C-alpha cells in the first residue's frame, strides 16, 4: 500500500570515446570477461583486433548469432569459462538482451555497451526473448539491472541518424505513459508504485527531447558529437530507461504492440511505431490543444512519423485498424494503466483522428 520502488543500473558511463575506458570498467570486476558482440560491430565499429590492446583483462570474444533466443542464450552460456568474472554485451538491443540473459543464467555481473541510442532498453532489468525466427516469445524479467551501462557517444554519432530519431520516439512516450501511471497509482515494472524521482526523470526526458532533439539530429547528420547530442543520448538511454521501468507504461506502448499485427509495419523501428502510439494516445486521453500541437511539432522537426502512411499504412482499412486496436486492448496490456477505462473502439477512433490531424498539418 503506497510503497514505491525505483530500480537502477549500478553505473552509467557516457561520453565521446568512452569505449576506451571499457577495459578499466571491466577490470573493476576481475581479470576475465566474456564478450558477446554483434558481427557488424566487431568488424566495422570496434575493429576485429580491438581487444588485442587489452593488458589487464582477458577477453573471450564471441560473435552473436543475431537473435536473442533461448537457443542462442544456451549456446553462448555453454562457452563461458567458470573463471569468468563479467559478461559483456556490445551492439544493438538483441545483443544486449542476450548478454543480460547469459549473465543472469550464470549469476555473473553484466556490462552493457549500446552502439546505437535507438531504444530505452539498455538500463532495464528485462530481456526480450524471441523464437529463432525472430517472432516474439516472452519477456524475461531480471532480478537485477545491468551493473554497468557504457555509452560511447562518438560510436552513436557515427550510426545513421534514423536510429537516433527512433530512440527519440521511444523516449517521447516516457513522460506520457509515466504520467498516466502516476495519476492512476499504477504499479511499475517492480510491482510497487513509482517514486517522485522516477516521474521527474520521465518529465526531464521529455523536456530534453523538445529542447535538444533537433540540435542532436544535426550533429549526428555530420557524425559529430556535441553537448546537445550528449543530452539526447542520456535522455534516450538513462532518463527514458528509468522513467519507463520505474515510472510505468500505458497507452503508447500498447498501441505500438497492436501495430505489430499488420505486417506492413515490420520494416519500421520500434521507436518510429511508438511515436504513432504516442500521438494516438494524446487524442485518446484528452490532452489539451497546445500539448497536441507541441508534440506534433516536435515529431515534425526531428522526422518522427505523424501519419499512418509514414509507418507503411497508407490507406489502411478500418478492418485492419480494428485488429490493431483489439490487440492493443488485450486484458494484459499496459493500456489499462490509463486512468480512463479503455476499449478497442476508443483506440481505433484515436488512431484515425490522430492520423487525420497529422495529414492535415502536412497538407495531405
Ligand atoms: Cl519509453
Ligand atoms: Zn519502448
From Swiss-Prot:
Domain of life: Bacteria
Gene3D superfamilies: 3.40.50.1970, Dehydroquinate synthase-like - alpha domain
This protein's record includes keyword ATP-binding: no
Binding residues annotated for NAD(+), in chain numbering: 38, 93-94, 115, 118, 124, 126, 130
Pfam annotation, one family: Fe-ADH
Catalytic activity from the UniProt record: glycerol + NAD(+) = dihydroxyacetone + NADH + H(+)
GO cellular component: cytosol
Pathway: Polyol metabolism; glycerol fermentation; glycerone phosphate from glycerol (oxidative route): step 1/2
EC identifiers of the protein: 1.1.1.6
Oxidoreductase is among the record's keywords: yes
GO biological process, one term: anaerobic glycerol catabolic process
Cofactors required: Zn(2+)
Record keywords, A-Z: Glycerol metabolism, Metal-binding, NAD, Oxidoreductase, Zinc
Classification via SUPFAM superfamilies: Dehydroquinate synthase-like
GO molecular function: glycerol dehydrogenase (NAD+) activity; metal ion binding
Cofactor mode of binding and number, as noted: Binds 1 zinc ion per subunit.
List of residues binding Zn(2+): 170, 253, 270
Role: Catalyzes the NAD-dependent oxidation of glycerol to dihydroxyacetone (glycerone).
Family: Belongs to the iron-containing alcohol dehydrogenase family.
Listed name of the protein: Glycerol dehydrogenase
Lineage: Bacteria, Thermotogati, Thermotogota, Thermotogae, Thermotogales
